[PDB]
């Protein structure tokens, strides 16, 4: 019910008991304090409206899905869609003060993958990793999510621009269902006034930007089933968050990385965090993508023949510059100016 927080956790790997078990960076600060893990969500009069962008360095996100400081964004993906590499990019190419990762995963190998990434990351001195492997109980799996959030909330109270990653809500929620069973609850017969299942919306409302403090911008991964179908957990989470990035198994098969399907993704704060000329270019690019998709299915239907339709020929000759804009080397980050300069070149 209480855990370690503070700048002394920067560079540390924390287990579901609040224990430091490993380090991927050593830092100057030794500050170690104690805060409750079941912190209340910000009262409505304390939240500030999302109006400043959280730049990610990822071309398609910053142009078409622009995030905001304090926003909660879902990442929806099937296995093998580069979810982890997208998270790595979001850490490496954004500009947060402090990154807090909560791995609610299954394999010890998964945690070490992330530790090894952090060990060679330019951001190692400002990240904290919290983990729970498959060995741990459902209670410990859940507490890992609560510990990552509490650590991030401390840094927010200090005034920091914090980015929080929970991977995954799927395994958190499934562990939470197990904990509910210990209390005698099922999703159809819930306890009252306190249900174990209420920890899910409570966990998701803690991010945001405080009027009197910093911000927590949160990315929650949701693991999709077969042909990218969304189970009830995925649909419930889609309605609570402030947007979602959809990773398409169909874009991944084709060698597009990041496998973000822009037309099935959205940032609900988009128009609040970019200016008019950005909005205009984004709208023009999305229509170009929609026209490209329309030409892809005409091609698959065997209906495209060059020189028949000058409009189709122009859309066809745009496919290569559009694909080049979308794709991104995972070691590469782009400034906002570079991204808007590139996208403008694409729609001319």
Swiss-Prot record:
One of its GO terms (cellular component) is cytoplasm. Its main location: cytoplasm. ATP binds at residues 80-85. It comes from the Bacteria. One of its GO terms (molecular function) is ATP hydrolysis activity. It is an enzyme of class 7 (translocase). Oligomerization increases ATPase activity. Monomeric forms exhibit low-level ATPase activity by forming short-lived oligomers with active site contributions from at least two protomers. In contrast, oligomers exhibit enhanced ATP hydrolysis rates that likely result from multiple preformed active sites within the oligomeric complex. Oligomerization is important for both enzyme activation and T3SS function. It catalyses: ATP + H2O + cellular proteinSide 1 = ADP + phosphate + cellular proteinSide 2. Its EC number is 7.4.2.8. Changing residue 189 to A: Abolishes oligomerization. Exhibits ATPase activity levels similar to the wild-type monomeric form. Shows at or near wild-type levels of hemolysis and invasion. Wild-type levels of IpaC secretion. Keywords: ATP-binding, Cytoplasm, Nucleotide-binding, Plasmid, Protein transport, Translocase, Transport, Virulence. Changing residue 205 to R: Reduces oligomerization. Lack of ATPase activity. Abolishes invasion and hemolysis phenotype. Low levels of secreted IpaC. It is found in: Cytoplasm. One of its GO terms (biological process) is protein secretion by the type III secretion system. Signal peptide: none annotated. Disruption phenotype: Mutant is defective for assembly of the needle and secretion of the translocon proteins IpaB/SctE and IpaC/SctB. Amount of the needle filament protein MxiH/SctF is greatly reduced. T3SS effector protein secretion is reduced in Shigella strains coexpressing wild-type and inactive Spa47/SctN. Belongs to the ATPase alpha/beta chains family. T3SS ATPase subfamily. ATPase component of the type III secretion system (T3SS), also called injectisome, which is used to inject bacterial effector proteins into eukaryotic host cells. Acts as a molecular motor to provide the energy that is required for the export of proteins. Required for type III secretion apparatus (T3SA) formation, proper protein secretion, host cell invasion and virulence. May play a critical role in T3SS substrate recognition, disassembly of the effector/chaperone complex and unfolding of the effector in an ATP-dependent manner prior to secretion. The core secretion machinery of the T3SS is composed of approximately 20 different proteins, including cytoplasmic components, a base, an export apparatus and a needle. This subunit is part of the cytosolic complex. Forms homohexamers. Interacts directly with MxiN/SctL (stator protein) and Spa13/SctO (stalk protein). Can form a soluble complex with Spa33/SctQ, MxiN/SctL and MxiK/SctK. This is Type 3 secretion system ATPase. It comes from Shigella flexneri. The gene is sctN.
